[model samples]
Target: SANNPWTGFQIFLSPYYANEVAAAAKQITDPTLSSKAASVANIPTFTWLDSVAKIPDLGTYLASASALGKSTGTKQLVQIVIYDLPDRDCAAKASNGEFSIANNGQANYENYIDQIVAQIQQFPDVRVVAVIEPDSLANLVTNLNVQKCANAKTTYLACVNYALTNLAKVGVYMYMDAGHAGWLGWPANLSPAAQLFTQVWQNAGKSPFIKGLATNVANYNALQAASPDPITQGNPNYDEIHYINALAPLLQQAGWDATFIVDQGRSGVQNIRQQWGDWCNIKGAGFGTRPTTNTGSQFIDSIVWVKPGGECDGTSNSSSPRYDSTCSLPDAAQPAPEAGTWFQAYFQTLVSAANPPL
Candidate 1:
């Protein structure tokens, strides 16, 4: 599920090209299948989204990200979401010993909203699925407070929700974050961790935020199946398994009526015994979720590679005798393969019985 990244239509590399280059540079740092992490399983296809406000630049990236399909020489019904407002940059800052929301994380909200609307004007027919801010509204919301954490989480959701409510005029499929059930579920439970899962949504009134939540960004699906222990049992956090199983039912209980999209990017790299520890170069793990669109009245809307074949949680700067940052200066030892390249290799390893419908 890859798109051709070459857009020869342009004479030079745009900033978007630079961004893709940056994305690619990050991809090549760790090539070795260092540890026993499960081999790649499922990966997601790529889509291009532009900010509605920033029409020109957004248009370029949208085009550049789209030009990738020229390789296949066929049009694949692809989707792109103009990720409107919310200064949702992945970069973070350190304050007094802890990190604070980075600059991009605290930009003017109204500007973002306007930019989103602008981008919508540029591409009315592009298949865009708006995924507001990646972690701000989902993962980091837990780390923020109503007054302390800049209300970034609340404001971020509000921005997306506003887009959802006001921008229906644009007709884009919007998806919110559903912190991996593994992350939501309590350490252990005979039943699902509805409370924790519900809290995440209730905290942001997530139901109104465009569509439903996206789960397992950068996490393994097996976390749902890992054995329960003191760490798993003691915490009220929803167990990953319970969350996965109960999601369909839980949505019904929550009165949510939207499709579910799960991230399958790194499900293949999940089997590594101690990835959480020796996580730098080679860890064993498989991708999560499958690459399909079959759903029974919306059991699972679609499995996506939101962060397809990328590094785990970005580069680290911690000083410990452990996982010395996965993305350190392109490794002086041996270069690891491209991020999602493993998926292609893994796909070839599978044996097929027969080709049909020729």
Candidate 2:
């Protein structure tokens, strides 16, 4: 199964999301637009297992997977993002969760990984794609002074290694986070990022560790560079595709031969203000490629919607805990909803603006 091409991979659509949005889309006065909106309402999305939410409980995940497995009669593809590293999102204010190294964060993280592993063990049959700690590894290399980032480096690795060791035992496909090109594409960051990734795998005490690396987890950079101009001054192809290609050789040289899965949910979006750096819930952003395994690249295993398109990336209001200036830019979506809340207007925009027309 590992070497052979996988056919009939099942994408799970959350009934809650489908029912919620299908009902909301009906109120749109434009009949044609409403019809289009309803058409894509039942589309499957990756379910986030955020530490802030304390999610993916063993019983709940297993139950959901069991039900889906029975209904679909195929291996259910559940995309879970492990997102609670100490001082997470240190490079940015938005999407910051409550975990930090200062507060016994390593012990807290060990428990977190243990819980996730236990849940995966409970559901042995479910094809779980576990995305290990988004922004954790990248931040450790680049954002040293951001709160407990430097302090939490060893702690982060211990948890990640534990996750990889156990999850691999249960046949869970683990994908470490390789932050998008905007953050790690440049030569300075890319080489160190690769080195850190290799070191983490070595620390795991496993030779062939993760199945692959996940790129552009929640960022909106296009899969391919829009135009072959330099975003990093010297190297072109700074898009997700190019970035993955650039990093592949480095990782391979370091003894990690891994595939890649990219988040194209918002990659179809062009930078609204040409700021290119604006990563919040920006206006005019749209869904890019749908999930697929037949990526043209040798190393890219699949293109996925790792970030659900409609959820608010961050809030603009001062009152919100995750509020950031990026969410209030002239081209940013207005009256921004809190991170992870259902934003009906944003959903409408995503579906309507979907490239390849949903």
Candidate 3:
């Protein structure tokens, strides 16, 4: 049942993206402007499954899923980001989740995964794309010795293993979160990161349990850009596709065959020459590519808006207790809204700065 091909891909458009577009549309009058705004509004956006707000009640998430299923009628592929982890974002202060091993984070996370699996099972009629824990695994490897990271490693893998084994059941597609190219695509990090990913998947009952790796989630990274002369290959290490291609074979050799999905919602436009690696609410970023399954790469499964653009990644004013210096950089937009809230001006900027123009 886990290997069954889906009937069709229906990217779920959450009401928040819809409403934000409507607001932007009202402010802009030009037809092209309106049309572009509509395009962005209409493109399907991901509905985050955050643990920061405490795991959403099972009844509420299911009701929301049922509503989307009823509205779409056809079998739909709703993207869900499983983003709660103990010591989440070890290096960065922003976007930290509620779970931590010291405070019973492991037990709570295990329970959350249990409930999520129950919910997915309940909605067998609806296809679910589970993006399993976006920054957790990568952070474990990148910040291996960081204080909080050092403490959470064992429990983190345990909970992730539990999720992989359980969520791989029929009708659910699982994509482990691989941090963006800026973080993992480097020569020094790629192989080690792949090793860690393969280890996690293998430990979690590999193959059908883990469908693929999702990259650039909640980060701005181009998917199909040509690498500079020194790094050129059929799939260079410069873009997400190349990064996946580079790492997939290594995982295969390690006995785990994996594909990939990417977040393009905030990567519409990127300055290849941009100096800083600040990913929090980038100033000139725009929607990159829309959701699609025809990725033209054997190992690449789909490109998706895993992280909905325009929603603030973090705030500059220290609105949230977790504030990063990157959030307050000169290049960043000022007075940013808290993570997960709608940013009207940012939405307008994304629409205006769109590379393909919606």
Give the clashing residue pairs of candidate 3, or none.
268-287, 268-288
Which one wins by lDDT: 1 or 3?
A: 3
Using lDDT, give the best candidate's number. Answer: 2
Name the candidate, 2 or 3, with the larger TM-score value: 2
- Give each model's whole-structure lDDT: 0.42, 0.74, 0.73
Model 2 vs. true fold: TM:
0.90
* Candidate scoring better on TM-score of 1 and 3: 3
**Which regions in candidate 3 have their CA more than 4 angstroms from the true location?**
1-7, 29-32, 52-73, 226-236, 318-320
Number of the top-ranking candidate, with TM-score as the measure: 2
Angstrom error of the Cα, residue 279, model 1: value is 8.7
What would the per-residue lDDT of candidate 2 be over residues 170-254, giving only the tens digit for each residue? 7777789988887888667888888888887777664443766889888878787657533344656467788888889998887
lDDT of 1 by residue, 44-135 (tens): 34432434334555556555545554554533233343343344432233111111234443244445555655665664434455554444
**What tens-digit string does per-residue lDDT give for candidate 3 at 1-358?**
1242333645555666678778777777777877788767778776777863534543354567677778868555566778787767766765557776788878888888887776677766667777888778888767877777777788778988888887876546788888877678776788899888888877866657478788988877678874432223322476776677778888788777677778888877766224435677778788777777667777877778877777787778765576776888766887887777777788778888887776
- Taking all chains together, each candidate's TM-score versus the true structure is 0.56, 0.90, 0.88
